[PDB]
Subunit: 388 residues, 4 copies
Amino acid sequence: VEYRNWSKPQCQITGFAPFSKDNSIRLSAGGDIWVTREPYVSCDPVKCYQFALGQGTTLDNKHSNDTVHDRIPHRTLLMNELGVPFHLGTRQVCIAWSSSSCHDGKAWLHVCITGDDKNATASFIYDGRLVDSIGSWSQNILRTQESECVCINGTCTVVMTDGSASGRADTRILFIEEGKIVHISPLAGSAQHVEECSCYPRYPGVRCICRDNWKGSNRPVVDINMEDYSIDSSYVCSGLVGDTPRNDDRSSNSNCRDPNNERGTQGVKGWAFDNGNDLWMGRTISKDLRSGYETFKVIGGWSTPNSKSQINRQVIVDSDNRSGYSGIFSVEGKSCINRCFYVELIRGRKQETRVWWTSNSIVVFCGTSGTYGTGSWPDGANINFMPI
Amino acid sequence: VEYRNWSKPQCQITGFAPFSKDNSIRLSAGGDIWVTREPYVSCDPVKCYQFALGQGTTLDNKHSNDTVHDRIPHRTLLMNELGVPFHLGTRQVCIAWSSSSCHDGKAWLHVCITGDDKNATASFIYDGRLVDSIGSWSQNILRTQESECVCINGTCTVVMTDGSASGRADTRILFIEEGKIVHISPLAGSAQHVEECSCYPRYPGVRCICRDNWKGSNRPVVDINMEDYSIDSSYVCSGLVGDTPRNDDRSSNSNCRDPNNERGTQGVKGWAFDNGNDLWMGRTISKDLRSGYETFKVIGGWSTPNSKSQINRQVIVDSDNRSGYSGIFSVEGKSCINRCFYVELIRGRKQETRVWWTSNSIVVFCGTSGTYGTGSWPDGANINFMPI
Amino acid sequence: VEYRNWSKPQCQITGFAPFSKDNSIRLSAGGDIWVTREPYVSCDPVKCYQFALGQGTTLDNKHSNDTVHDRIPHRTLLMNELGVPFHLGTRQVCIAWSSSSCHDGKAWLHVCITGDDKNATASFIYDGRLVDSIGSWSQNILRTQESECVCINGTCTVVMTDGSASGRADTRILFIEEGKIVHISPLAGSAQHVEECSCYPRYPGVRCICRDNWKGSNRPVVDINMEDYSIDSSYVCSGLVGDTPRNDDRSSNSNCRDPNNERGTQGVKGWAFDNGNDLWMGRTISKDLRSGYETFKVIGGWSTPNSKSQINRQVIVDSDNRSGYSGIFSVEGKSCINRCFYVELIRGRKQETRVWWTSNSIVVFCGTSGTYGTGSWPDGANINFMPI
Amino acid sequence: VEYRNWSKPQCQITGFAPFSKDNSIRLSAGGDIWVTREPYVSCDPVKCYQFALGQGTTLDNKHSNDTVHDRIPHRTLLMNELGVPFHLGTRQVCIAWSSSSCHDGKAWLHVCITGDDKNATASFIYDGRLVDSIGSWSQNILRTQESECVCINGTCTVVMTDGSASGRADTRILFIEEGKIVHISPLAGSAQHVEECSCYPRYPGVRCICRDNWKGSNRPVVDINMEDYSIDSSYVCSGLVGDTPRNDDRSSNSNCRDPNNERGTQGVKGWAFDNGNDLWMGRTISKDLRSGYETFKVIGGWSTPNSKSQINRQVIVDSDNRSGYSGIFSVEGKSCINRCFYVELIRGRKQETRVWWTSNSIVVFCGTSGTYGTGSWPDGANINFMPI
Ligand SMILES: *[C@@H]1O[C@H](CO[C@H]2O[C@@H](C)[C@@H](O)[C@@H](O)[C@@H]2O)[C@@H](O[C@@H]2O[C@H](CO)[C@@H](O[C@@H]3O[C@H](CO)[C@@H](O)[C@H](O)[C@@H]3O)[C@H](O)[C@H]2NC(C)=O)[C@H](O)[C@H]1NC(C)=O
Ligand SMILES: *[C@@H]1O[C@H](CO[C@H]2O[C@@H](C)[C@@H](O)[C@@H](O)[C@@H]2O)[C@@H](O[C@@H]2O[C@H](CO)[C@@H](O[C@@H]3O[C@H](CO)[C@@H](O)[C@H](O)[C@@H]3O)[C@H](O)[C@H]2NC(C)=O)[C@H](O)[C@H]1NC(C)=O
Ligand SMILES: *[C@@H]1O[C@H](CO[C@H]2O[C@@H](C)[C@@H](O)[C@@H](O)[C@@H]2O)[C@@H](O[C@@H]2O[C@H](CO)[C@@H](O[C@@H]3O[C@H](CO)[C@@H](O)[C@H](O)[C@@H]3O)[C@H](O)[C@H]2NC(C)=O)[C@H](O)[C@H]1NC(C)=O
Ligand SMILES: *[C@@H]1O[C@H](CO[C@H]2O[C@@H](C)[C@@H](O)[C@@H](O)[C@@H]2O)[C@@H](O[C@@H]2O[C@H](CO)[C@@H](O[C@@H]3O[C@H](CO)[C@@H](O)[C@H](O)[C@@H]3O)[C@H](O)[C@H]2NC(C)=O)[C@H](O)[C@H]1NC(C)=O
Ligand SMILES: *[C@@H]1O[C@H](CO)[C@@H](O[C@@H]2O[C@H](CO)[C@@H](O)[C@H](O)[C@H]2NC(C)=O)[C@H](O)[C@H]1NC(C)=O
Ligand SMILES: *[C@@H]1O[C@H](CO)[C@@H](O[C@@H]2O[C@H](CO)[C@@H](O)[C@H](O)[C@H]2NC(C)=O)[C@H](O)[C@H]1NC(C)=O
Ligand SMILES: *[C@@H]1O[C@H](CO)[C@@H](O[C@@H]2O[C@H](CO)[C@@H](O)[C@H](O)[C@H]2NC(C)=O)[C@H](O)[C@H]1NC(C)=O
Ligand SMILES: *[C@@H]1O[C@H](CO)[C@@H](O[C@@H]2O[C@H](CO)[C@@H](O)[C@H](O)[C@H]2NC(C)=O)[C@H](O)[C@H]1NC(C)=O
Ligand SMILES: *[C@@H]1O[C@H](CO)[C@@H](O[C@@H]2O[C@H](CO)[C@@H](O)[C@H](O)[C@H]2NC(C)=O)[C@H](O)[C@H]1NC(C)=O
Ligand SMILES: *[C@@H]1O[C@H](CO)[C@@H](O[C@@H]2O[C@H](CO)[C@@H](O)[C@H](O)[C@H]2NC(C)=O)[C@H](O)[C@H]1NC(C)=O
Ligand SMILES: *[C@@H]1O[C@H](CO)[C@@H](O[C@@H]2O[C@H](CO)[C@@H](O)[C@H](O)[C@H]2NC(C)=O)[C@H](O)[C@H]1NC(C)=O
Ligand SMILES: *[C@@H]1O[C@H](CO)[C@@H](O[C@@H]2O[C@H](CO)[C@@H](O)[C@H](O)[C@H]2NC(C)=O)[C@H](O)[C@H]1NC(C)=O
Ligand SMILES: [Ca+2]
Ligand SMILES: [Ca+2]
Ligand SMILES: [Ca+2]
Ligand SMILES: [Ca+2]
C-alpha cells in the first residue's frame, strides 16, 4: 500500500444513517465487560475499529467503585473491530489516560499520555513499536484529542494542550512521520482556548473544531497547513452554537472571531464540518447537562456570522437520555470521502447514584445521500438491573 | 476474485444430510450467550457464517425479560463462523430489527432496517462502509427477507415490503451494485401478499418462495429477471401446502394462481425449490402451531396444480418439539450448485411460561445425492434447568 | 500447495518427549468449558489442532448430568489449535457422535456420523461443504476411528464398522477423493473383529492397529493398499499384548494370526507402530481398568510371534491415575515423518461418583531421537473441588 | 523472510517510556484469568507477544490454593499478543515449569523443561513441531532463562543450568539450528554461579547479565561468541550493584572479576546493558525484599570497577509496592536496535496472607531518545477485594 492522501471531494449529504451500536452496558449486567470512557473510532483502508480508555477492571468488579476519576496509572487504550464489545479478549495497545490514533496508510500511530499530572509523558508507538516520546511542557496536565488524528502523505497531525483547564494554556500541533516527531507548531490566531480537538481531512489541509473551556460557548476552529506547518484559528460563525453549557437559541451568538463570552467555562468534546457556506453539526439537546443528541445543517452557518437558520434535523438520542463526548471520523469511498460520527453514552456515578461506577456505551452514524427516517438509540440499560 | 454468476446446474438430490447445530440454549444455562431470533446463514466463496438479530443482552441477564417483542432500538445483526455460538466476542455488524445479507463475490452486502415503525430507515453497508440508505414508503413497518439476498454479475437482489401485515401492502424488489441502489421494481403478477422472501439463484434469474400473511395458506412465488428487472409472481402448485396455519392434507389445495383462501391470515417464514416438474419443500409437522419439521419431494408439485403425491420424507424435528422460521442457502460445488436449509428452534416466552425470555437455536441440513437415515435434532434444552 | 504423499522414511526414535497438555478439567472448576470424550489430534502442513466430540453443554451446567451416554443428537465435533482449551468460542464443525478427520494437503476432510442407532447417516464434509453421505449398512451402530484418517496423493482412507459390538460385524474401508466416496473395500484377512482403528501412513500404504472387542486381547492389524484398494489383516505378534482387559504378562500370548481368546470381549482404543522387526506401543498399566499409561519397545515384537522382551519404558500417567482412549498422529519433518500420540484422561461418573458428569482431559507426546527423563502427567483435578 | 542477524548499532537512549500493562490481577477479581509467574516478552519481526508459565487453573478457582510452588506437572507456557490478558482462549504452547523462547526470523523456537527434579526433560519445539530433546545432566533441577533466547543467522542461543541452587553447578550454552541442537559449550571464565540469564544481541555476539545465587550480590556476565562457540564470563564493574539481597550503596562494591561475597546467597532475575563505558540497569528499590523498581545509568559502570556515580533515574514501581522478576527484550527499528524491559509484579501468598494463591501482573517500558516524566505503575489490585 502507499500513503493515504485524502484527495477526493467531500460527499454531498442529506443527513445521517444508523451504522453501529455496541450495547456495552446492557451486556455488563450479565457478562465480563470493561469499564470505559472517552471512546472513538477510526478505520484503516479496509475496516473500522472502536477504541476507548479502559479503567483497569470489569464493571461487575469491586475495583469499578469510584471510576468517575479521569486519571489513574491503570487506564490503557483498548482496540476492537467496530461492533464487537470490550470483552476480556480485548487488546490493551498501550498505557494511557488520554490518547489519539490514526492510520497513515501503511500502519497505525498511537499517541498515549500518562504519569503524574505535573510531569506527564506521551508515547508515540508506530507499527507496533515505541519510536519517540515527549514530556510535559507546562507541568499542568498534558492532554490531546481523545479521537483520531489524521495523516496526509505519511505525515500525521495531533494537537496537544498543557496548562490551565480554565485559563491561558499552551496548545501545540505536532507533526510526526513514521512515529517520529518531525516538527512542532505553537498555536496562533484568534482562538482563546483550545481543547479535545475534532479533526478531519480537507485536503491539502486538516481542520479541527475543538472545545473552548474558558471563555467560550461557541467552538474554536484550528486550520493546519500541511505544507509550511502554518496554523490559523477562529470560532464557528453559526448563531446557533454547539457547546454545553450554553445560552438558549434566542440568547445565543458568535461573530466567527472571538469567544461569545456566554457560559464559556466548562464544555464537552464536540464536532462540526463545512459544507460550502453551510455547516453540519451535532450538540446535546439540553443546554445545561449532557442529555440527548440531535444533528442539523445551518444554512449559511460557516460563512455568515450569527447564522441561526437551521434545517434537516434528526434526534439521535432523545431529550430524556444521557449522552457524553462526541467525535467525527472520515471514511474513503469510491468517489468522495464521507463524514461519520459517534456518540458516547455515559451511565452511572455522579449523576445516577444507585451504582458506584462509571462506564459508557456508543452509537455511530454515517452520512448519506439517500433517504432516512426518525427514531432514538440510547444506551438502553435499566439502572435498576444488576451490577452495584 | 471476480463476481459470482451462479452458472452451473442445480445438483440432483435424494434428500438431505446433517450439517451443523449450534446448541445455543443448552449452553446459555452455563455461559454468557446472546438472546436471538430470526437466524439465517450465508457462505462466501470459502466458508459459511451464521447470522441472527440479537436482543442487546445475554440470556442470563435481567435485561432478557420480555424479549417476545420483535422491534426495539437495541437489536443489531450478529455474524459468526457457522458452528461457533453467539458468545460475547461475537460481532454486531449493524443496527437492525430486520435484515438480509449476501456476498457478491467481492465482499458482503448487509441490509439492516431500524427506527420508528411508521418511519423506518434501511441501511446498505457494502465492503464495511455505509454506501446508501432508504426511508419507509408506506409508513407501516418497512421489512425484508430475514435471510440471504443473492447477487449475479455483481448485482444483488432484495425484496422489501411496507404496509399492512394483513392487507394490501407495497412490495418492491431492489437492485444494488457495490452497495448502491441502481433500480427499484414494484411487485406484479397474481401474488396477493408477499412477506419474508425465500430467494435462491436459478441463473439467469432469482426465485423466491415467500410467505402470504393475508389470504393464503399456499406460498407465493416471485420471479426476478436479472436482465430487464422484470417481475412475475404466483402461488406454488402443490396440493399439499407448506404454510402454518393450514388445512389438513385432505382439505388442502392450490391452483398455482390465487391464494387458496384457507386459513390464510398469519404464517411463518418458509421455503421450497423446483426440481423439474417436482418440488422439494419443508414445513412444520403440525398444521396449527410451529412444532416439528419434516421435508419431502412432491411428484409433479411444481408443474401440476393441486399435486398431493409425495415421497422421500424425513423428519428433522419430531412432532413433540418446537421449531420456528426457516430459510434456504445455496452453495457452489465443483459441478453443480447445492441447496441447503436451516431451522430456527425457538424456546421460551409466550409458549413456555416458566421463563420470561425468548431466544432460539438452529440446525442446518444440506442436500445430498448419496444415502442417509433417520433421527430428530431439536434444541435439546431442559426448560426446567436454570435461567429465569 | 499440492497433495500430501508422505514419502519420507520413518524417523528412528529413542522414546518420546512431552508436547502438550490442555488441563481442561482443572479449568472447568472456574470457567465455562465444554464436556468432552473421545478426543484426538491432527496437523495440517503448518500446525496441529485438537478435536473431541462435545456433549452440547458446559461442565458447570445442569445439562451435564448423565453424560456417560455415548450417543445423543447434541454431540458435535469441536476443533481448536492444539493447546487452547475448549471454551465457548470453540467451533462446532459438524453434528457427530463418532468421527475421523484428516487433511489431504489441500484442505480438511471431516467424517461425522449421527442419527438413530439402527439407521445412522455419516456425512463427508470437504473444504467446508457437504459433498457426499452414506447410510447404515447393518442397522446396528455405524461407527469409525475417533482419530485422524490419512490421505496419500489426494485419496483419504477411513475404516467404518456396522453391526455386533461383540459378534461378527461388517467392517469396510472407504476411499474418498475431494470429499467424494470413490470406492468401498470389505474387510479380508484373519482379523476377527475390528474397531476404533489406529491408522498411520507407511507409504505407499496405510496401516491401522485396531481394537478387537469380541474374542481378542491382542490387537488386529489392517493393511490397506492404496494402489488396488487391497486389504490384509492379522493380529500383532508381541507376546506382551496391548489391550484392556488382558492377561498378565506371564499368562499372555499371540501368534500374529488369530485372537488369543483371553479376556477378549471389551477393549479400549489403542495403538502401536512398526520399527523394523521391533514394535513401539503403549497400554494402560492396569490389566483390568483404564488406569495409568506406559510406553515401550518390544525387541522383535513385530516379526517374531509371542515376543515378550521389552525395553525403553516410560510411564506417562502413573499407576494411581485414570486414563482412557489413545491414538497416534504423524507429523512431517525435514527428513523423516515422526510418530506422536495423545492420551484421553477421563474423569467423573460411573467410576468417580461425587459428580454426575463425565468429561476428559488430554496429554500428548511426540517421538524423539535425543535424550529425556521420567515423570507423570495426569489430569490433575481435585474431584472434591467444585462442579456437581 | 530471511534469518535475523541483528546488524545495526544500539540506539542511544536518554531513559525509558511506558509501553504496556496487562492489569491481570484487577481483572481476576471479576473474570476468568489464569494464575501465572515468571513472565516475559519477545517480538517477531512484526509484533510482540507476552508469555508466562501458567499454573493449570484460573485464579478464582479452588485449584489456585498453594500456588507458591514453582514446579508441578501442570505448568505450561502461554502466549498472547502483548496487551491482551491471559483469558481462557489463551494458548498453551507446551508443558513447561521453566522456559525460554525466540524467533530466528523464520519462526519460533520454544524450549520447555519438565518432569521429575532429579531427571527432567527439556523439549525443543521449532515451527510448531518437536525436533529434539535433552535429559538432565546433574540430576538436580535442569533450568534455563525464563525470558527470550536470541538467534543470529539462524542459530539461537540458550543457557541452562543443572545442579546446586547454592553451590557449584553445571552451566552450559546450547546452540540450536532449526530446532536441532548443533553444539554444546560448557561455562568458562571467572563467573562463580550463573542463573536465569538475561541475554541480548550485541552483534556479532550475544551477552547475558545473569543471577548469582551462591556467593554474589554483583551480577555475572556471560559473553557468547557466535563464531567459534567460545565463552567468557565475569561480574559487572558498577560499584552500585543490582541484585537483591544486597548491601546498601555505601557498603557495596565489585571489582568486575569475582563475586563480591556480600549477601551473595539467593537473588532475583535481573538485567543490565552496556552503553560504551556506561551501564543501564534496573533493580528493586529495597535491598532486602522484592519491592519497588527503579532504573538508572551509572557513569563508567561498565569499564571502571566499583563505579557508583549514577544519573538519569526513574522509579517504575514506587517504594511501597511489590515487584518480582525482570528481563530485557530487543526490538529492531529503522536504524538501530532498541532495548526494552518488563517487570513482573507478584501478589499473594507467602507475603500477603489474606489469599491462598500466587499470581502476577506485568508492566513494560522501552528505551527512548526523546523526553519523558515521572510516575509509578504497580499492579493496582486491592488485596481486600474478592478472590480467596
Ligand atoms: C464504594 O465506595 C465507598 C467507599 O469504599 C471504599 O472503602 C475503602 C476503605 C476502600 O476499601 C476502597 O476500595 C473503597 O472503594 C463505599 O461507601 C461506604 O458506605 C457505607 C454505608 O454503611 C459507609 O458506612 C460506614 O463505614 C465505616 C467503615 O468505612 C463503618 O465502620 C461505619 O460504621 C459506617 O457504617 C462507609 O463509610 C461508606 N464510605 C463512604 C465514603 O461513603 C461503598 O460502599 C463502596 N462499596 C460499594 C459496594 O459501592
Ligand atoms: C419480568 O417481567 C414482569 C414485569 O417486570 C418489569 O417490572 C418493571 C417495573 C420494570 O422493572 C421492567 O424491567 C420489568 O421487566 C415481572 O412480573 C411481576 O411478578 C410479580 C409476582 O409477585 C408481580 O407482583 C406485584 O408486583 C408489584 C410491583 O410491580 C408489587 O408491589 C405487588 O405487591 C405485586 O406483588 C409483578 O407486578 C409482576 N408484573 C407483571 C406485569 O406480571 C417479572 O417478575 C419480571 N422478572 C422476572 C424475574 O421474570
Ligand atoms: C442428576 O441425575 C439424577 C436424576 O436427575 C434427573 O431428574 C429428572 C426428573 C430430569 O430432571 C433430568 O434432567 C435429571 O437429570 C438426580 O438424582 C436424584 O437424587 C435425589 C436425592 O434425594 C432423589 O430423590 C428422590 O427424588 C424424587 C423426585 O425425583 C423426590 O420426590 C423423592 O422424594 C426423592 O427424594 C432422586 O429421585 C434421584 N434420582 C435418581 C434416579 O437417582 C441428580 O440429583 C441429578 N442432579 C444432580 C445435581 O446431580
Ligand atoms: C487452602 O489450603 C489449606 C489446606 O487446604 C487443603 O486441604 C486438603 C485436605 C486438600 O483438599 C487440598 O486441596 C487443600 O488445598 C486450607 O487451610 C485450612 O484451614 C482450616 C481453618 O479452620 C483448618 O482447620 C482444620 O481443618 C481440619 C481438616 O483439615 C478440620 O477437621 C479441623 O477441625 C480444623 O478446623 C485446616 O486444617 C487448614 N489446614 C492448613 C494446613 O492450614 C485452606 O482453607 C485452603 N482453602 C482455602 C479457601 O484457602
Ligand atoms: C492521491 O492518491 C491517488 C491514489 O494513489 C493518486 O492517483 C495517481 O495519480 C495520478 C492520477 O491518475 C496518476 O499519476 C496515477 O495513475 C494515479 N494512480 C493511482 C493508483 O493512484 C492521486 O494523484 C493522489 N492525489 C494527489 C493530489 O497526490
Ligand atoms: C501530497 O502528495 C502529492 C503526491 O505527489 C503532492 O502532489 C504533487 O506535488 C509535487 C510537489 O509537491 C509535484 O511535483 C507533483 O506534480 C504533484 N502531484 C503528484 C500526483 O505528484 C501534494 O503536493 C502533497 N500534498 C500534501 C498536502 O502534502
Ligand atoms: C460464470 O463464471 C465462470 C467462472 O468465472 C465463467 O467461465 C469462464 O468463461 C468461459 C468458459 O470456459 C471462458 O471464456 C473462460 O475460460 C472461463 N474461465 C473461468 C476462470 O471462469 C463462466 O463463463 C461464467 N458463466 C457465464 C454465463 O458468464
Ligand atoms: C452474467 O455475465 C455473463 C458474463 O459476461 C453474461 O454472458 C455474456 O453476455 C454478454 C452480453 O450480456 C455476451 O457478450 C457474452 O458473449 C456472454 N458470455 C460471456 C461468458 O461473456 C450474462 O449475460 C450475464 N448474466 C446475467 C444474468 O446477468
Ligand atoms: C512426494 O512429494 C515430493 C514433495 O512434493 C516429491 O518431490 C518432487 O519429486 C522429484 C524429487 O526431486 C522431482 O521430480 C521434484 O523436483 C520434487 N520437488 C518437490 C517440490 O517436491 C516426491 O517425489 C513425492 N514422492 C513420490 C513418491 O511421489
Ligand atoms: C503417489 O504419487 C506419486 C507422484 O506421481 C506416484 O509416483 C509416480 O508413479 C507414476 C505412476 O503411478 C509414475 O509415472 C511416476 O514415474 C512416479 N513418481 C513420480 C514422482 O511421478 C506414486 O505411484 C503414488 N503413490 C501412491 C501410494 O498413490
Ligand atoms: C544483515 O541483514 C541485512 C538485512 O537483510 C543485510 O543487508 C544486505 O547486505 C548488503 C548491504 O547492502 C547487500 O549485499 C544487500 O543489498 C542488503 N540487502 C538487504 C535486503 O538486506 C546485512 O548485510 C546483514 N548484515 C550482515 C553483517 O550480514
Ligand atoms: C552472519 O551472516 C553474515 C551474512 O553473510 C556474515 O557476514 C559475511 O561473512 C561471510 C563469511 O562468514 C563473508 O563471506 C561475507 O563477505 C560477509 N558479509 C555478508 C553480508 O555476506 C557474518 O559473518 C555472520 N555473522 C555471525 C555472527 O554469524
Ligand atoms: Ca466552554
Ligand atoms: Ca398465511
Ligand atoms: Ca477385546
Ligand atoms: Ca545472589
